[PDB]
Short mmCIF file of C-alpha atoms (C1' of nucleotides) in Angstrom, two decimals:
data_model
loop_
_atom_site.label_atom_id
_atom_site.label_comp_id
_atom_site.label_asym_id
_atom_site.label_seq_id
_atom_site.Cartn_x
_atom_site.Cartn_y
_atom_site.Cartn_z
CA UNK A 1 66.74 -15.98 -29.94
CA UNK A 2 67.00 -12.94 -27.69
CA UNK A 3 63.66 -11.30 -27.07
CA UNK A 4 63.83 -7.47 -26.17
CA UNK A 5 61.09 -5.75 -24.19
CA UNK A 6 59.65 -3.02 -26.12
CA UNK A 7 61.05 -0.12 -24.12
CA UNK A 8 64.45 -1.58 -24.26
CA UNK A 9 64.68 -2.06 -27.83
CA UNK A 10 67.49 -0.19 -29.62
CA UNK A 11 66.82 3.04 -31.89
CA UNK A 12 70.62 2.78 -32.41
CA UNK A 13 71.89 -0.83 -33.58
CA UNK A 14 71.35 -1.35 -37.37
CA UNK A 15 70.26 -4.83 -36.46
CA UNK A 16 66.81 -6.34 -36.39
CA UNK A 17 65.37 -7.29 -32.98
CA UNK A 18 62.80 -9.70 -31.74
CA UNK A 19 60.00 -9.46 -29.19
CA UNK A 20 57.02 -10.79 -27.65
CA UNK A 21 53.96 -8.26 -26.92
CA UNK A 22 50.21 -7.79 -26.48
CA UNK A 23 48.10 -6.76 -29.14
CA UNK A 24 45.69 -4.07 -28.00
CA UNK A 25 44.38 -2.83 -31.24
CA UNK A 26 44.57 -3.87 -35.10
CA UNK A 27 43.55 -3.11 -38.53
CA UNK A 28 42.57 -5.96 -40.84
CA UNK A 29 45.22 -6.88 -43.34
CA UNK A 30 44.57 -4.86 -46.52
CA UNK A 31 46.27 -3.80 -49.46
CA UNK A 32 47.55 -0.51 -50.36
CA UNK A 33 49.76 -5.53 -48.27
CA UNK A 34 49.77 -4.08 -44.65
CA UNK A 35 48.48 -4.80 -40.94
CA UNK A 36 49.07 -1.82 -38.40
CA UNK A 37 48.97 -2.88 -34.67
CA UNK A 38 49.24 -1.12 -31.51
CA UNK A 39 51.30 -3.42 -29.09
CA UNK A 40 52.24 -3.12 -25.30
CA UNK A 41 54.25 -5.14 -23.04
CA UNK A 42 55.15 -4.75 -19.09
CA UNK A 43 57.89 -2.05 -19.78
CA UNK A 44 55.37 -0.20 -22.18
CA UNK A 45 51.79 0.62 -21.27
CA UNK A 46 49.82 3.22 -19.46
CA UNK A 47 51.51 4.12 -16.03
CA UNK A 48 51.67 6.88 -13.64
CA UNK A 49 47.48 4.57 -22.87
CA UNK A 50 50.95 4.52 -24.16
CA UNK A 51 51.91 1.71 -26.76
CA UNK A 52 54.17 0.98 -29.42
CA UNK A 53 53.19 0.56 -32.92
CA UNK A 54 53.74 -2.43 -35.17
CA UNK A 55 53.65 -2.30 -38.93
CA UNK A 56 53.86 -5.63 -40.90
CA UNK A 57 54.58 -5.71 -44.67
CA UNK A 58 53.98 -8.57 -46.98
CA UNK A 59 53.29 -9.56 -50.57
CA UNK A 60 50.27 -11.29 -49.94
CA UNK A 61 47.18 -11.00 -47.68
CA UNK A 62 47.73 -14.87 -46.60
CA UNK A 63 50.99 -13.86 -44.91
CA UNK A 64 49.67 -11.08 -42.41
CA UNK A 65 47.85 -11.54 -39.09
CA UNK A 66 43.98 -11.28 -38.47
CA UNK A 67 43.47 -10.00 -34.94
CA UNK A 68 39.80 -10.43 -33.82
CA UNK A 69 40.80 -9.74 -30.27
CA UNK A 70 42.40 -7.51 -27.96
CA UNK A 71 44.83 -9.15 -25.43
CA UNK A 72 46.09 -11.99 -27.63
CA UNK A 73 49.97 -12.13 -27.67
CA UNK A 74 52.08 -11.79 -30.80
CA UNK A 75 55.84 -12.32 -31.26
CA UNK A 76 57.77 -10.98 -34.30
CA UNK A 77 61.11 -11.88 -35.36
CA UNK A 78 63.50 -9.93 -37.65
CA UNK A 79 62.00 -6.66 -36.39
CA UNK A 80 63.46 -3.26 -37.26
CA UNK A 81 62.77 -0.43 -34.82
CA UNK A 82 62.27 2.99 -35.83
CA UNK A 83 60.70 5.81 -34.22
CA UNK A 84 57.60 7.21 -35.99
CA UNK A 85 56.15 10.67 -34.78
CA UNK A 86 57.03 10.11 -31.00
CA UNK A 87 56.07 6.66 -30.41
CA UNK A 88 58.09 3.42 -30.98
CA UNK A 89 57.22 1.94 -34.05
CA UNK A 90 58.41 -1.51 -35.20
CA UNK A 91 58.74 -2.82 -38.63
CA UNK A 92 58.61 -6.32 -39.93
CA UNK A 93 58.99 -7.38 -43.79
CA UNK A 94 57.17 -10.71 -43.72
CA UNK A 95 58.17 -11.15 -47.52
CA UNK A 96 61.68 -10.66 -46.82
CA UNK A 97 63.12 -12.16 -43.39
CA UNK A 98 60.45 -11.27 -40.73
CA UNK A 99 57.74 -13.66 -39.15
CA UNK A 100 55.06 -13.38 -36.84
CA UNK A 101 53.24 -15.66 -34.73
CA UNK A 102 49.92 -15.46 -32.48
CA UNK A 103 49.50 -16.84 -29.15
CA UNK A 104 45.99 -17.42 -27.62
CA UNK A 105 46.25 -15.49 -24.08
CA UNK A 106 42.91 -17.16 -22.89
CA UNK A 107 42.27 -20.79 -23.08
CA UNK A 108 40.91 -20.72 -26.53
CA UNK A 109 41.60 -18.55 -29.71
CA UNK A 110 38.95 -16.85 -31.15
CA UNK A 111 38.59 -19.14 -34.11
CA UNK A 112 38.62 -21.75 -31.79
CA UNK A 113 35.99 -20.87 -29.39
CA UNK A 114 33.89 -20.30 -32.31
CA UNK A 115 34.26 -23.98 -33.53
CA UNK A 116 34.48 -25.76 -29.82
CA UNK A 117 38.23 -27.08 -30.30
CA UNK A 118 40.88 -27.37 -27.82
CA UNK A 119 44.47 -25.96 -28.31
CA UNK A 120 47.21 -28.26 -29.32
CA UNK A 121 50.15 -27.59 -26.84
CA UNK A 122 49.64 -24.08 -25.47
CA UNK A 123 52.82 -22.94 -26.34
CA UNK A 124 51.49 -23.63 -29.85
CA UNK A 125 50.72 -20.72 -32.05
CA UNK A 126 46.82 -20.56 -33.41
CA UNK A 127 48.72 -18.83 -36.27
CA UNK A 128 52.01 -18.02 -37.59
CA UNK A 129 53.38 -16.75 -40.80
CA UNK A 130 56.08 -19.06 -40.64
CA UNK A 131 56.78 -22.03 -42.78
CA UNK A 132 55.50 -24.00 -39.47
CA UNK A 133 56.96 -22.16 -36.73
CA UNK A 134 57.92 -23.66 -33.51
CA UNK A 135 59.47 -22.34 -30.14
CA UNK A 136 62.61 -22.94 -27.85
CA UNK A 137 62.24 -23.73 -24.06
CA UNK A 138 63.75 -20.09 -23.16
CA UNK A 139 60.51 -18.75 -24.26
CA UNK A 140 57.73 -20.67 -22.54
CA UNK A 141 58.59 -18.60 -19.46
CA UNK A 142 58.27 -15.38 -21.51
CA UNK A 143 55.06 -16.26 -22.97
CA UNK A 144 53.70 -17.40 -19.76
CA UNK A 145 54.71 -14.12 -18.10
CA UNK A 146 53.43 -12.20 -20.80
CA UNK A 147 50.02 -13.98 -20.36
CA UNK A 148 49.75 -13.46 -16.67
CA UNK A 149 50.60 -9.70 -16.99
CA UNK A 150 48.26 -9.38 -20.06
CA UNK A 151 45.46 -10.42 -17.61
CA UNK A 152 46.43 -8.23 -14.64
CA UNK A 153 46.71 -5.42 -17.08
CA UNK A 154 43.33 -6.03 -19.00
CA UNK A 155 41.64 -6.62 -15.62
CA UNK A 156 42.73 -3.39 -13.83
CA UNK A 157 42.95 -0.96 -16.79
CA UNK A 158 40.79 0.09 -19.73
CA UNK A 159 43.40 -0.69 -21.96
CA UNK A 160 41.49 1.13 -24.84
CA UNK A 161 41.88 4.21 -23.44
CA UNK A 162 39.05 6.89 -23.05
CA UNK A 163 40.69 8.81 -26.03
CA UNK A 164 41.40 5.99 -28.49
CA UNK A 165 37.41 6.05 -29.43
CA UNK A 166 35.03 8.34 -30.38
CA UNK A 167 31.47 8.46 -28.53
CA UNK A 168 28.81 7.70 -30.76
CA UNK A 169 26.76 10.82 -29.74
CA UNK A 170 29.81 12.58 -31.57
CA UNK A 171 29.76 10.71 -34.48
CA UNK A 172 27.69 12.64 -36.81
CA UNK A 173 30.01 15.76 -36.24
CA UNK A 174 32.88 13.62 -37.30
CA UNK A 175 34.68 14.59 -40.57
CA UNK A 176 36.04 11.55 -41.64
CA UNK A 177 37.25 8.35 -40.07
CA UNK A 178 37.17 7.20 -36.25
CA UNK A 179 37.06 4.22 -33.95
CA UNK A 180 34.25 3.13 -31.55
CA UNK A 181 33.69 1.12 -28.51
CA UNK A 182 30.26 -0.53 -28.03
CA UNK A 183 28.09 -3.48 -27.25
CA UNK A 184 26.48 -5.44 -29.91
CA UNK A 185 22.84 -5.32 -29.05
CA UNK A 186 22.01 -7.47 -31.91
CA UNK A 187 23.33 -9.26 -34.93
CA UNK A 188 20.81 -9.87 -37.65
CA UNK A 189 21.56 -11.84 -40.90
CA UNK A 190 20.57 -9.49 -44.06
CA UNK A 191 21.54 -12.02 -46.53
CA UNK A 192 24.09 -14.84 -47.66
CA UNK A 193 27.19 -12.66 -46.93
CA UNK A 194 26.47 -9.93 -44.52
CA UNK A 195 25.12 -8.99 -40.98
CA UNK A 196 23.62 -5.92 -39.37
CA UNK A 197 24.99 -5.03 -35.98
CA UNK A 198 23.16 -3.22 -33.92
CA UNK A 199 25.49 -1.11 -31.72
CA UNK A 200 25.13 0.99 -28.35
CA UNK A 201 27.95 2.34 -26.60
CA UNK A 202 28.51 4.40 -23.22
CA UNK A 203 26.99 7.57 -24.50
CA UNK A 204 23.53 5.83 -25.02
CA UNK A 205 23.53 6.13 -28.83
CA UNK A 206 22.23 3.29 -30.89
CA UNK A 207 24.32 2.93 -34.39
CA UNK A 208 24.02 0.09 -36.96
CA UNK A 209 27.02 -1.39 -39.32
CA UNK A 210 27.09 -3.68 -41.88
CA UNK A 211 29.79 -6.39 -41.30
CA UNK A 212 30.59 -9.28 -43.56
CA UNK A 213 29.58 -12.64 -42.00
CA UNK A 214 33.20 -13.92 -42.55
CA UNK A 215 35.61 -10.99 -42.30
CA UNK A 216 34.11 -10.95 -38.66
CA UNK A 217 32.74 -14.26 -37.73
CA UNK A 218 33.26 -13.52 -34.08
CA UNK A 219 30.63 -10.86 -33.89
CA UNK A 220 27.99 -12.06 -31.29
CA UNK A 221 25.01 -10.64 -29.69
CA UNK A 222 25.57 -9.23 -26.23
CA UNK A 223 29.30 -8.64 -26.51
CA UNK A 224 31.62 -5.57 -26.63
CA UNK A 225 33.84 -4.75 -29.69
CA UNK A 226 36.17 -2.02 -30.65
CA UNK A 227 35.45 -0.90 -34.19
CA UNK A 228 38.88 0.32 -35.75
CA UNK A 229 37.81 2.90 -38.36
CA UNK A 230 34.20 3.69 -39.02
CA UNK A 231 32.81 6.66 -40.75
CA UNK A 232 29.26 8.32 -40.22
CA UNK A 233 27.01 7.88 -43.17
CA UNK A 234 25.80 11.38 -43.92
CA UNK A 235 22.93 9.81 -46.26
CA UNK A 236 21.38 8.30 -43.16
CA UNK A 237 17.77 8.74 -42.75
CA UNK A 238 15.69 6.85 -40.05
CA UNK A 239 18.86 4.65 -38.81
CA UNK A 240 22.05 5.99 -37.94
CA UNK A 241 24.73 4.09 -39.69
CA UNK A 242 28.56 3.56 -39.32
CA UNK A 243 30.41 2.42 -42.52
CA UNK A 244 33.25 0.01 -42.48
CA UNK A 245 35.98 0.00 -44.92
CA UNK A 246 38.48 -2.77 -46.08
CA UNK A 247 41.00 -2.11 -43.42
CA UNK A 248 38.46 -1.59 -40.77
CA UNK A 249 38.39 -4.20 -38.12
CA UNK A 250 36.06 -5.68 -35.36
CA UNK A 251 37.76 -6.46 -32.26
CA UNK A 252 36.66 -8.38 -28.82
CA UNK A 253 38.42 -8.52 -25.59
CA UNK A 254 40.03 -11.18 -23.63
CA UNK A 255 38.12 -12.45 -20.65
CA UNK A 256 39.97 -10.34 -18.11
CA UNK A 257 39.16 -7.00 -19.81
CA UNK A 258 37.55 -4.46 -17.41
CA UNK A 259 36.34 -2.27 -20.04
CA UNK A 260 34.52 -5.06 -21.97
CA UNK A 261 33.00 -6.48 -18.64
CA UNK A 262 31.82 -2.91 -17.45
CA UNK A 263 29.88 -2.20 -20.82
CA UNK A 264 28.24 -5.37 -20.93
CA UNK A 265 26.88 -4.66 -17.50
CA UNK A 266 26.30 -0.68 -18.04
CA UNK A 267 24.95 -1.03 -21.52
CA UNK A 268 21.63 -2.78 -22.28
CA UNK A 269 18.49 -2.60 -24.64
"C1'" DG B 1 54.28 3.34 -45.70
"C1'" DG B 2 52.64 3.87 -41.28
"C1'" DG B 3 45.28 6.18 -39.05
"C1'" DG B 4 45.45 3.17 -44.36
#
DNA sequence: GGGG
């Protein structure tokens, strides 16, 4: 097809558009089915962060992307562009015509590095909504360019801007929902289905949250994650606990991430 | 319907 760059898409023509973009933030797929993402590309990011928004609709959880890592790439077809509150908000009905495909930016897909498998052909999506989606050559280039940029971006910028999350030392004064960015100091198996994450962000605070072993199998001790949509447990006593919801999400960062690398270094037990 |  014809893939438009995020800032070049039309807010004028009634026709669907297609594009490749980097995924920097995402909700888990949930039912109201939806998945909301924050995407960026070379023409749209934080420069002298800024980003476009992507909402995906479907009639079943199985037809939505599960983003476990910031930095991977996505490409959607039959997307409609709307302007929702200042940002560029792209919409895609997976149940109708639209489709999506995820491409790993690192050598391995999250799911993959967990299972020690090698990628098919790395022009091959590690997950797609299609009925068994493929790609034409005109693309290889685009996908290879976005990947290179992706690492140049994540490598020199924080990506997850200092104002996209809330320091933990300000968690208790929060009313409602907020995001976090911390280092997992420990993963503990409480039982058959869930773990207990011991978190510590740059503020130096220690928090805990319960994560379902399967919603987030990538969770690992010593790693940095971004937690989308937590809440402070007003009923907490000895421990300070954050509470995840169904749309909540635990996100890791591709290996080039400056933010992730720095926090692994700065934060410790 | 989208920070749900």
